[PDB]
Amino acid sequence: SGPVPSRARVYTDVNTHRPREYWDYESHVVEWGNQDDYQLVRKLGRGKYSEVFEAINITNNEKVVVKILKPVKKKKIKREIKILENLRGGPNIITLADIVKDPVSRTPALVFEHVNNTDFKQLYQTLTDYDIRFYMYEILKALDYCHSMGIMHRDVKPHNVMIDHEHRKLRLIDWGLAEFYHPGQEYNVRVASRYFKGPELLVDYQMYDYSLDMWSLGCMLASMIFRKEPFFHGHDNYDQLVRIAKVLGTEDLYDYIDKYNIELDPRFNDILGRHSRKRWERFVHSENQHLVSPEALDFLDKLLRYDHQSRLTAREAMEHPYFYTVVKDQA
Numbered sequence: 001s002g003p004v005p006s007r008a009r010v011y012t013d014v015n016t017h018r019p020r021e022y023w024d025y026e027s028h029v030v031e032w033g034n035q036d037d038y039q040l041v042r043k044l045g046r047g048k049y050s051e052v053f054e055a056i057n058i059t060n061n062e063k064v065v066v067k068i069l070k071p072v073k074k075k076k077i078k079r080e081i082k083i084l085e086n087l088r089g090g091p092n093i094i095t096l097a098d099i100v101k102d103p104v105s106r107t108p109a110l111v112f113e114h115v116n117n118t119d120f121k122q123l124y125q126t127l128t129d130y131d132i133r134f135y136m137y138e139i140l141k142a143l144d145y146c147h148s149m150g151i152m153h154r155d156v157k158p159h160n161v162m163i164d165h166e167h168r169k170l171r172l173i174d175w176g177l178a179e180f181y182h183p184g185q186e187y188n189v190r191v192a193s194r195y196f197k198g199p200e201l202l203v204d205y206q207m208y209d210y211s212l213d214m215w216s217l218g219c220m221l222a223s224m225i226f227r228k229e230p231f232f233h234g235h236d237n238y239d240q241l242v243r244i245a246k247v248l249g250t251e252d253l254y255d256y257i258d259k260y261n262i263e264l265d266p267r268f269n270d271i272l273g274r275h276s277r278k279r280w281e282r283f284v285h286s287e288n289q290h291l292v293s294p295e296a297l298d299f300l301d302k303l304l305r306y307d308h309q310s311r312l313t314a315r316e317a318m319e320h321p322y323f324y325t326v327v328k329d330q331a
């Protein structure tokens with residue numbers, strides 16, 4: 001027997017109610033700017049599918065970030081562009097400023113708003129309890145917005161969170177893995193970095209939704225309050241599920257597998273073993289106790305659930321007691 005179908009608990013049919021053009025990115029026609037408006041200043045990074053640079057827009061003297069793409073399927077470039085344009089002006093969503101192509105090389109490049117980022121491997125270790133709640137609330141604004149717009153980011157991790165700590169400015173970036181949610185659609189499970197992959201990805205459950213981003217957000221929160229990066233440190237995708245089972249327990253995992261009639265890869269049987277559900281206190285010590293509170297733990301618990309349907313939505317998460325003071329100060 002095949003797996004049991006699943007539907008998003010919230011924003012289920014937002015794309016169905018939209019005109020086709022909104023989500024049918026394959027038919028999207030790219031609007032190109034002028035490549036001569038931009039001059040590369042310095043390199044910021046290299047990736048598997050791109051090279052990133054800092055640039056100057058010589059028409060207005062503004063600092064920008066330029067992502068020059070390596071060979072990528074045109075439908076995937078159209079997907080990222082279409083999502084970026086649909087999300088433009090949304091809270092804490094990076095702004096796509098321009099799309100340019102080299103006239104000779106035919107190489108496409110995405111031009112973004114620049115964020116004066118403080119690298120997370122330096123910033124996070126300085127963040128107070130209030131900073132973690134404030135920045136977690138800001139990512140949640142970006143997530144509730146993109147989910148309400150029928151989009152799952154699918155790559156939520158510290159590297160995709162740009163923070164200008166001086167101006168308390170956060171942007172959720174790199175929409176290259178993002179997809180439109182369609183009820184009944186089977187998605188590719190080979191998405192996200194190892195440490196942030198949800199149980200649905202690791203067990204090969206394809207009918208997932210926005211709730212995937214909520215697991216990732218839970219992984220980030222656990223690493224920040226416990227000062228343990230990564231929180232679930234698997235040696236591969238199979239061992240990644242073992243690392244989660246050693247914390248959440250194997251009982252709720254097999255209850256999750258049984259509920260959705262998931263065919264578990266035979267490799268898993270001999271590595272998963274039998275594990276009890278641990279108490280969050282075993283990750284608490286003298287150097288992280290100032291970031292850990294009963295509110296933080298309660299919130300974290302409600303994010304990290306094997307059953308995607310039982311995790312908090314981004315809007316429910318914003319309503320949690322953990323954010324009461326952030327909500328108060330913002331009024």
Ligand SMILES: N#Cc1cnn2c(NC3CC3)cc(-c3sccc3-c3ccc(=O)[nH]c3)nc12
Nearest residue numbers: 044045052065067112113114115116117173174
């Ligand atoms: N989008 C965007 C964006 C805004 N600011 N910003 C900064 N700012 C620091 C230099 C101060 C760095 C990067 C970097 S650094 C290495 C890779 C990337 C990158 C850029 C685009 C993308 O889609 N993924 C990854 N991206 C951005």
